[PDB]
Amino acid sequence: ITVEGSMSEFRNPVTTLTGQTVDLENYNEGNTYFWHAFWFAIGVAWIGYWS
Amino acid sequence: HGEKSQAAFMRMRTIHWYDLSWSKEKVKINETVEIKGKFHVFEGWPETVDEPDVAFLNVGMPGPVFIRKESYIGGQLVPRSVRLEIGKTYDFRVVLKARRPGDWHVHTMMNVQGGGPIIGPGKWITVEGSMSEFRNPVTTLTGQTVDLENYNEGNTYFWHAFWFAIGVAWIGYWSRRPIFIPRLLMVDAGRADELVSATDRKVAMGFLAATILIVVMAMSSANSKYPITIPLQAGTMRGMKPLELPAPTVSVKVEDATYRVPGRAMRMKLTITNHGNSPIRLGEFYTASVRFLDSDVYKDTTGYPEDLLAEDGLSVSDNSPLAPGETRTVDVTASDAAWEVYRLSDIIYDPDSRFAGLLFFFDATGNRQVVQIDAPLIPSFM
Amino acid sequence: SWSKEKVKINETVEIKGKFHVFEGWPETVDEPDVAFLNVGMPGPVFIRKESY
Amino acid sequence: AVRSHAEAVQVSRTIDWMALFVVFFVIVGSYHIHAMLTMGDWDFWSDWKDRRLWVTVTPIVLVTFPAAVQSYLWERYRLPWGATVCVLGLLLGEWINRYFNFWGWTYFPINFVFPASLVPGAIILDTVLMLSGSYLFTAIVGAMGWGLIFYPGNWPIIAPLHVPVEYNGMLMSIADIQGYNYVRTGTPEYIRMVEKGTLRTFGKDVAPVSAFFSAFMSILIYFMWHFIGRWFSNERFLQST
Amino acid sequence: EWINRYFNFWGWTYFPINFVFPASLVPGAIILDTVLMLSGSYLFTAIVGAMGWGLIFYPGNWPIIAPLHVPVEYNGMLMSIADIQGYNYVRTGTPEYIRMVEKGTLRTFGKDVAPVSAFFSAFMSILIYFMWHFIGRWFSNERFLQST
Amino acid sequence: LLDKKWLTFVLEIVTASILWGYLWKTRDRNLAALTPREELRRNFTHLVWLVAYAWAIYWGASYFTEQDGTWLSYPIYIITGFAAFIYAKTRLPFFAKGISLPYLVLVVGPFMIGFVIFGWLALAVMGTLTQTFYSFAQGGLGQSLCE
Amino acid sequence: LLDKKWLTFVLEIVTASILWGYLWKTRDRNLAALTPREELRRNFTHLVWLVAYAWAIYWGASYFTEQDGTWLSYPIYIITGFAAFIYAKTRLPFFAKGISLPYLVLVVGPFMIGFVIFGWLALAVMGTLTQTFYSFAQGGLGQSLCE
Ligand SMILES: [Cu+2]
Ligand SMILES: [Cu+2]
Ligand SMILES: [Cu+2]
């Protein structure tokens, strides 16, 4: 099967039972990055404090 | 009361009990209470619970307040593990004999090999009298009548007390002398070789010989008395008869199902297909030990428990008689306080939001037909 | 049905019949989901040329 | 320090009694945990008290603490009743709980929920431990005695419960009838790991074969738990936890 | 985990990051280390810090996985956002049935799937910490063999 | 005098706080200046704690664990065991200047109480008991015993 | 000088042959006549091999093992580890006259890499690292450190 176009145009919307429409391509990605980077920063800060 | 504590979806689609009938509500000691009914093993048996390839029909009470005198599934006695087929319908019959006065439950429940208890609906039964009047006679094949309430109790006490007395006598014999500190000091400070000596060795040989000889003589006596004995009988019974229910003439397909969170109502949409030559009306929706009934079409007269009975809890938007061959789509709402009392609203917390139940269709003639439904259950919040 | 009662070397003996697997198969024995039709003799005094 | 000889002996006696109390009750608690969390199902019920699984399992998992307590008490005080005290403590806990909770709160009959008897096995173990004090001879012969005499030890108690009965058209034992009558919500029949038959049993050999298997595995468990108790008997003083 | 997610899961294949994000263990590690230092006794560490590691693992990742647990009606059957992601983004080697996840049980009572699992993980983590402390102690030796 | 009749004689968390705190703050710093006569009087009280510990283990691991089998005490015996540990470590000689391995195992195992592996840790009572006997046989060994 | 910029800086079987052979043939026989100053210069190069070994283990056991999870390096880090072993044993004192058990385990485990049991053998890097620190603290211990 041949697919033409660009990945940037792709969209995967979905509507939750709570009542909002979210895009699964970028849903929760910001929160995931924020929390993982925050915990990694805390770990690196501790290791640097003792280093 | 283990029911309700279990997962809502697991309770709804494991086993369905219907046509339950208790012989009596209030009895006295030594009287018999008979529980009859049919249970249908659901086709969509959950994967997490092992199939009832080896299952046992139990009865749930807080301790042996009733002795299970008899228990039949179909027409044969089932006192040991049995094999159930998925989707088949069986009829069971349990005879209970009152033993302890007070108010008790019953729970038409069961036990499966890899899932443990499956509690069915239970009814309060009051017992009057005194425990001293209770009797459980039984006649052995050897030819004597014995009372299981006090059979072998004297022999059990005698032998256990005798062996405990021998043990205590030995420990006291070696405890009359000073025990811990002097003996530890003597054994540490070089060779002791004085804490154990004649005639302690002689008396311990006496103890060992007496123990072995007493065991052998007691075994011989228990082989002289009671000369006929058999091993314990066990083994799953197969080839077990289910009910040959006629093929239902009513086809119901569920288009979505919802329940208010929080709420006490379950709303679902049905497409009833009618066959045969009779006008049918939906009369009862049995989901998990809870009977939602429509008073305008059917009323319960079997003494079903009040907390599990919804006399007008089943509301149908268009409950007019359905002509044969004609199919219509109607919204069915089953609302009762029991839906939250027995924790049927925690299916949202359960990891499989699918329900199953039985629909009972009645006609003007009077006879009823059972059809089964199973559809995903979609909670709603706004 | 056994084809012959007394035979000589290199001769063929044929055993025919029907076996019925009981409905009440005991639980302690695993179901014959994988079973093999053997023939019991004290060592290969007969070679199982064929088995159907 | 100490005043005189006689009151020193009195102090030694008081310490003996207090130490016997503490060791006895700690052993009761721990070994009761071990029994009920490794074996308890069979011991609860007469119909569970079969001849294959009961006879096999109970000595194997109940030689554990007696081995360790012998390894300590004999080696440290020449006191040949470690197995006996362990067994007496288990029996005391079993019986008080049967009489006060099984028959007290619930009403399971005593002849139905009676526990097993292990005093003959304990006595053989202790006497073999003392006479010819070698621990290896103990683990070889006394462990076999413990395994072998367990079933004939309880036979005078369970023999009256094995009388055949025709119960509603199907054959039953008195123990089977008791289990069928007195309902057990948490312990259904199918959980009964009991003798359910086999195509590899020949004649009257269910009990002797199980007894001998229990004896050999009890030899092994005694040998392991003797060293476990020997390790538990150390006096090491750590300096840095 | 993160470099491989970003360069291989999202680089060669195109599994979304919010779908193939790894777990977070920094809170557990921090509790373990601080309990190790404060009251430096290894046994108190294995008893309390291991419990902290086991217990805070799920609430540690909860801020990340909570938005993925919003219920959705997906083609007539109830689903989570994570379930929809797994259903959509196909995994040739990891089908749904391999998912050893909470599939229900007749021996669970109420809202106790997570706390019971958390406490079981905490206790078995105590045991594994106690074992691996001695394993690492053995691995820390300075022995010089003379004959291999 | 010597041994007295002590032998005859949210909340759980609170009770452990004061009982451990009161016992640990009241430790004797000058342990060397300790006469053997008062040692034996003090050394009995440690055995009383062990007796109270055996009672609590028995009341917790026997009457209550199988009680669920027919179907508080764990914190009670936890507190009793740790209190006995602190009492031994602080008040007694031959228990200070080091943590006793069997005593620590006996205190911790039932505390941390899959419980089959943990219930064996109560067998450390044997090492505890031999250590307590050695503590007794320090000044009051003789003269009488071994004679 | 001391440490230089080495830190910035069929075929697999062949490469191991020369690299082990060249390193083993070029071993210093007169190890005793070795000044501490040149030791530290030589002792850094051993640490460079360990750093190259950690890079190779990381590049082999992290980027490439899970690479199949989404679905050369093993021989590369095998060669690097055995080369570091030979370098330590030959050139360095405190590593000769005996095979280091943790160093041998660290070299062999990942080499022999069911791999769960074998991946723990890379924890021997802790014993390797403490041994390397002891090797550093032979002549260059002071004066400065511990003062
Ligand atoms: Cu109930
Ligand atoms: Cu059904
Ligand atoms: Cu047949």
Swiss-Prot record, chain B:
Disulfide bond sites: none
Chain sites annotated for binding Cu cation 3: H105, H107
GO molecular function: metal ion binding; monooxygenase activity
Pfam families attached to this UniProt entry: Monooxygenase_B
Subcellular localization: Membrane
Region called Cupredoxin domain used to construct soluble pmoB (spmoB), residue ranges: 1-140, 233-382
EC number(s) given by UniProt: 1.14.18.3
GO cellular component, one term: membrane
Primary role: Methane monooxygenase is responsible for the initial oxygenation of methane to methanol in methanotrophs. At least in vitro, specific quinols can replace NADH as reductants.
NCBIfam families: AmoB_BACT, CH4_NH3mon_ox_B
Name of the protein in its database record: Particulate methane monooxygenase alpha subunit
Swiss-Prot record, chain D:
Cysteine pairs bridged by disulfides in the record: none
Ranges that cross the membrane: 17-37, 53-73, 80-100, 105-125, 139-159, 209-229
EC top class, as a word: oxidoreductase
InterPro entries (alphabetical): NH3/CH4_mOase_suA_sf (IPR037001), NH3_CH4_mOase_A (IPR003393)
Signal peptide: none
UniProt subcellular location: Membrane
Protein name: Particulate methane monooxygenase beta subunit
Gene this chain is encoded by: pmoA1
